Ligand binder design. Sequence first.
Ligand SMILES: C[C@H](C[C@@H]1CCCCN1C)C[C@@H](C)c1ccccc1
Ligand SMILES: C[C@H](C[C@@H]1CCCCN1C)C[C@@H](C)c1ccccc1
Ligand SMILES: *Cc1c(COP(=O)(O)O)cnc(C)c1O
Ligand SMILES: *Cc1c(COP(=O)(O)O)cnc(C)c1O
Lengths: 435, 435
Amino acid sequence: TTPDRVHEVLGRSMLVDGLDIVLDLTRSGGSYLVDAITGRRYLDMFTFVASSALGMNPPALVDDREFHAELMQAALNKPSNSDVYSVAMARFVETFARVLGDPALPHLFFVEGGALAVENALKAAFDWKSRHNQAHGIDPALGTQVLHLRGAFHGRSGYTLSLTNTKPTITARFPKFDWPRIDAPYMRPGLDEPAMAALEAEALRQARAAFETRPHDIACFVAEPIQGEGGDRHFRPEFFAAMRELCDEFDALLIFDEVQTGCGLTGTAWAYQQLDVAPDIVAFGKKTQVCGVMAGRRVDEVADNVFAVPSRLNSTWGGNLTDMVRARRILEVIEAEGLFERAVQHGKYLRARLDELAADFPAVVLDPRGRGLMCAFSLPTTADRDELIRQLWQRAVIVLPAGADTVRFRPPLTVSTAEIDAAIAAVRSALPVVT
Amino acid sequence: TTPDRVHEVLGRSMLVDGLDIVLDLTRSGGSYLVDAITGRRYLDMFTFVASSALGMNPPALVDDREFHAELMQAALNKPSNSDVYSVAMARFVETFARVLGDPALPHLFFVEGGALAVENALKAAFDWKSRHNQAHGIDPALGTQVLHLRGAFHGRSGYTLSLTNTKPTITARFPKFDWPRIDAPYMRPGLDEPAMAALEAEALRQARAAFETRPHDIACFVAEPIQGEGGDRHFRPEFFAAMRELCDEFDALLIFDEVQTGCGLTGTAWAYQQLDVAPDIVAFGKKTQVCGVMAGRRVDEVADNVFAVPSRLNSTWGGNLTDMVRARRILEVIEAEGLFERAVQHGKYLRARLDELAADFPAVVLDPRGRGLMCAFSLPTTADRDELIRQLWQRAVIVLPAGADTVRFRPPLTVSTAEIDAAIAAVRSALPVVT
Ligand SMILES: C[C@H](C[C@@H]1CCCCN1C)C[C@@H](C)c1ccccc1
Ligand SMILES: C[C@H](C[C@@H]1CCCCN1C)C[C@@H](C)c1ccccc1
Ligand SMILES: *Cc1c(COP(=O)(O)O)cnc(C)c1O
Ligand SMILES: *Cc1c(COP(=O)(O)O)cnc(C)c1O
C-alpha cells in the first residue's frame, strides 16, 4: 500500500474527512510535518490537536539508543497495567510525580483516553459526595449532578456528553443527564475591572442558585481553566477563586479538566498553578500520552474513597505501556531542557506578534489573547475564519479553528521564534486576501 | 528503579492490588510470564484479561526485523489518526477488513478502550433510531434506551455503567439511566431442550413487554454472545435468533459486544459467526489492541447515519497507532498460521480434559463448558473458587475468577496441548486440598 493509495484504502471502510496529506512518519521532525505524497513540509501549529509536546521525532528520543530498547520492549506487547506491574510502569509513575505532581494531589490513576480521564474524575466525585452525604446523615442516593460551564468541551463519552456544549453535532440525539449548566464569564475585549466583576457575579449567582435548588445533589464543579474547543476563552483568577469558595461552602469538589491546558503549554505544568486556585481533582490527557487523574485535597476526607477501595475504578489495560514509556522520556526532556520556561518566553513573543497583527489589521484581527504558548485570535465572521484557515493551508501552515470565529495556535513547546515569525508572516500574507 | 522496588514506588501514588509478580518484559514468552524478582515462570491462562492473542513476545514479531522498524516508527510518536492519515494506519485497516471483516458490516471505527467501543456502537444506535423515527413520522426525541441482559459486563464508562450489572462494586453510587434489563436464559447443567425453551420464552416475553411499554424508545439490544465477567454463561443460538427477529419487528438494532469473545478465541473470528445470527453492529477490543466497531446491515437504511456524517463520532487520537501496527502483524500471524482452526482443535482438547475433571470430581468440578479456547468450570461455593485460585497461584498457574463461583481459562491462541495438560495437572493437585 502506497502513500498515494492511503485515502482510497481507508475510504472503503471509513469516512475520510481529515487533512489532504499523508504523514511521513520518518521525515517529519520538530515543528514540521512532511507530506509523503509530495514531500512538501508543513509548519505545525496544530500538534495532533495540541497532543504533542515536542513535535515529531524529537532528537532526544530518536538519538537515545537505550530509550529505543526500552520503547521496543514496551511496544512489542500490551500488558494489563491494572494488575501486572513492571519496572517500565514504575519509572513512568515516579517521573510523572516528580515533573508534574502536586503535593496536595498524591493519588494518581491512569487510563486510555481524555474523555475517560474526565469521567474517572467525575466518578471519584459522585462516590465522594454520596459517602460524604451518608457520613453526615444525608441520603446516600444524593450526589449525582455535575455543575459546569456553557461552551465547555470535556469529551464525547457517556458522562461527558452531558457536559460538552459547543457544536450541536457533537451531542445531538444522544441521551443526556439534565445537569446544571451556568454562563461562562470569560474575558472579552473592552470590558474593564467592574464590567468584568459584574459578569462574574452573574455566573456566581447562577452557580449559587443551582446549589440551593438541588441540595446535597451536586457532587462537583468541572471547568476547563481556559476553554479550548469552545474558542480559547480565558477567565480571571477571581472567578475560579470565588467558585473554589462556593464549592467548599456546599461540600462539592472542584475538578479542573486540564486535558488541553496541561503539560506546560501555558508556561507551567498546569494552568491552575497560575490562577492560584487549588482543585481537588485534575484530569489530564493529550500531551501526557497516557490519560488520567490526580486527586487529593478534600478527596482524602472520605476514607473509603475511590482511590483507597479496590475495583471502584478500572480498565482492562490501565493505560498504554508504550505511551507510559514515551511520556516519561518526554517529561525528562521537559525537565532537563527547561521547557516550561521556554513556553513562557516564546508565548510572550507569539502574543506580542498577535498584538502587532491587531494594530495593523484593527477591524479584522480581533481579540488577540493567550497564556504561554496557548494563543488565539478571532475574525469578524466564521466565513472569514474558515477562509483564513484555507489560505494558511495553501501556504503550508497548519492551524486549528475553534468556536464560531477563532483561530488557535498550538505549537510544540520546542517552537523557535523563527518558526513563530514564519507562522505570522503567513497570516499577514493571507489577511488582505480574506478582507 | 529496581524490580524489588516497583511495588514500593507505585504504592506511593496508587492502590496496588494486582499480582505479586513484576513482569519481565524481555524474558516472558508464549504461554509463560516471568517474574523479574525471582525468575520463576508462570503458566498463563489469563493473557492480560484475555487481551493477548499470541502471548508474550511472539517469535513472528520478535524475529521480524522489518516489523521492528515499522513498530519503532509508530511507537516514537502518537498521531491523531482521526485527522492525520498514514501508510501504517491504512495497512492495519485493510488487513483488519481482510482477516476479521464481515461483508455485511463495511463501516469501521477505531478508538482507545473497550468501554468506548461499546459506547460508539450505542451512539450509532441512538442516532439511527432517532433519525429512523423522524423519517417515519415519530418524535425524534424518542430512541434513547438500550435493552440488555442481567449479568452483563460492557465496561465502566458513562453509558456502559447503566448496562454492566455483575459486582455492585463496579456500579454503586454512580448515576445511571434507567434502561430495560431482562433475565439471561443461559445454559445450565441438567436442563433439557423444552426446559431450555421455556426459560428462553420467559426472557423473550420480558423483552417483548419492554418494547411495547416504551414504544419507539428502545434504540437497540446489546449482548455478549457469551457472558465473560458474569461467569462464562453461554446461550443457545435459538435465543439470539429469536431476539434478532424481535429486534427487526420493533425497528431496533442488535449489537454484539465481542470485546472478550472476539478475535478467534471461540474458534472463529467472532462468536456470532457460530451462532448464525447477523448483528447490525459489533463492538471489539482487547485482543484487537485498538478497539472500535463494525457496522452495517440495517445501519445503512438511515442515509445520514453516524458513519456517513462528519464529526458525529470522534476522539483526539482515533486509536493508538502503535496498537494498529502491532495488531496488523498479529492478524497476519493468525491468518498465515491458521490460528482460528488451532483454537477449535485445542479448545476441544481443553474441554475434554475438563469433562474428565468433572467425572473424577463430580461434586466439586461443576458445569464444565466452553466454546473454542473460551472455557470454564464452577465450584460449589465462592470460598472454594477463591481457594482453588490461590492454590493454582502457588503452583505458578495464572487463571481468572468470574462471577460468584467460576474459574475461567483464557489461554493464548498459540497454547500447546502440553501447556493445557500442565494447567489441568495443577488443578488436579489443588482439588483434594480445597475439598
Ligand atoms: C477492569 C474491569 C473489570 C473488573 C475488575 C477486575 C476483576 C473483575 N472485574 C469486576 C472493567 C474494565 C473492562 C473497564 C474499565 C474502564 C471502562 C470500561 C471497562
Ligand atoms: C474529537 C472531538 C472534537 C471535535 C472534532 C474535530 C474538530 C472540532 N471538535 C468539535 C472530541 C474528542 C476529544 C473526544 C472523543 C471521544 C471521547 C471524548 C472526546
Ligand atoms: C473488556 C470488556 C469491556 C471493556 O473493556 P475496557 O478496555 O477495559 O474498557 C467491554 N465489554 C466486554 C464484554 C469486556 O470483556
Ligand atoms: C481532548 C479533550 C478531552 C477529550 O479527549 P479525548 O482523548 O479525545 O477523549 C477532554 N477535555 C478537554 C478539555 C479536551 O481538550
